Amino acid sequence: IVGGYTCGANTVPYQVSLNSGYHFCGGSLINSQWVVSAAHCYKSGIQVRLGEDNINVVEGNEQFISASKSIVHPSYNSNTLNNDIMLIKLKSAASLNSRVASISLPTSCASAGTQCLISGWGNTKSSGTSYPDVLKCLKAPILSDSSCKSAYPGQITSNMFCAGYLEGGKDSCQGDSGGPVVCSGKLQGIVSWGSGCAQKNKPGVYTKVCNYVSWIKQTIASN
Ligand SMILES: [Ca+2]
């Protein structure tokens, strides 16, 4: 997360770390047994880490659970990053508490100019390499589709939105792929891509979760 702040420990209780010997992506807890992340975060042998703040120290609140199953969206295109969404089933149910909570699925899509919260652990620098150990946060509006498609001509589909600032400086890219974008108490986004990091007229590009709620509910209930 470039150009934000330290959330505070356990202030984003739905935030998940996907670990494969190291932290490689974020995710969101949508119920005791399921996580949603990005399809470009697909690996084998994932461990899901809940209740984290500092990913390098065991601060007491953690829950470490092996993933039993991963489901990538049937229409995921890894070239265009269209339908960049994946579902991860926990081997054992998470124990929900003050620090470990679910986030709700949208009943409807969010509109432009709606403020959202984007959280994650990744690269804080637009130029160079600096990985934070603690959860970071950014508040950013959803930009209008016009403003989005203009920044990435012929790259943006219906299943994407942009958030942040047209001037750059503040963005998420490498700053946690797969991470949540929460607007008015609902999961509206997943950190998908963005050209460079926090560049001028290069916003972040998010998977538009409200398009997928039917897929998510049908998949989860059948698996
Ligand atoms: Ca920790």
Side-chain angles (χ1 to χ4, degrees):
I1 304 287
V2 188
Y5 61 97
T6 305
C7 297
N10 309 317
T11 295
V12 180
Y14 52 78
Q15 180 71 221
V16 152
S17 169
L18 304 182
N19 182 281
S20 63
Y22 56 91
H23 170 73
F24 73 91
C25 276
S28 298
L29 193 66
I30 55 175
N31 64 226
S32 64
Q33 309 207 57
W34 291 90
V35 166
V36 63
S37 190
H40 74 269
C41 291
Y42 175 76
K43 273 193 184 292
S44 175
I46 303 183
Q47 183 183 248
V48 180
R49 298 184 162 212
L50 299 146
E52 287 288 358
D53 184 46
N54 191 308
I55 53 177
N56 282 310
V57 348
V58 175
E59 306 187 286
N61 296 336
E62 295 103 336
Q63 298 176 55
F64 296 163
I65 309 171
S66 304
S68 58
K69 219 171 78 287
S70 295
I71 311 182
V72 172
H73 191 274
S75 298
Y76 174 55
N77 192 288
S78 71
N79 293 141
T80 72
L81 291 168
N82 187 201
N83 312 92
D84 191 18
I85 182 172
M86 179 180 66
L87 261 34
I88 303 174
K89 188 181 190 170
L90 294 179
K91 186 176 183 178
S92 302
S95 326
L96 301 179
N97 52 236
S98 61
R99 325 109 167 208
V100 181
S102 300
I103 187 60
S104 306
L105 258 18
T107 61
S108 195
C109 299
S111 51
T114 301
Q115 286 276 31
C116 303
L117 179 65
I118 306 162
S119 48
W121 276 278
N123 200 358
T124 55
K125 307 303 170 190
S126 68
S127 301
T129 307
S130 178
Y131 287 86
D133 286 352
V134 281
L135 233 203
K136 16 208 59 183
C137 282
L138 176 62
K139 296 181 185 68
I142 302 171
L143 294 172
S144 65
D145 288 341
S146 304
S147 151
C148 192
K149 293 166 175 176
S150 53
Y152 307 101
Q155 298 179 249
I156 303 296
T157 76
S158 69
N159 298 314
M160 300 177 185
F161 72 97
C162 289
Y165 309 96
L166 291 156
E167 59 173 57
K170 311 179 190 174
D171 196 32
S172 67
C173 114
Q174 306 163 219
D176 266 344
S177 288
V181 185
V182 175
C183 321
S184 302
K186 277 86 193 179
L187 185 65
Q188 299 288 182
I190 301 167
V191 182
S192 182
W193 60 286
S195 179
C197 240
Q199 248 67 279
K200 191 180 180 181
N201 277 275
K202 297 292 173 276
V205 188
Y206 303 95
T207 304
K208 184 193 269 194
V209 174
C210 62
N211 291 344
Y212 299 100
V213 176
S214 310
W215 178 70
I216 301 172
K217 297 180 177 177
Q218 161 63 27
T219 300
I220 279 179
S222 306
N223 286 275

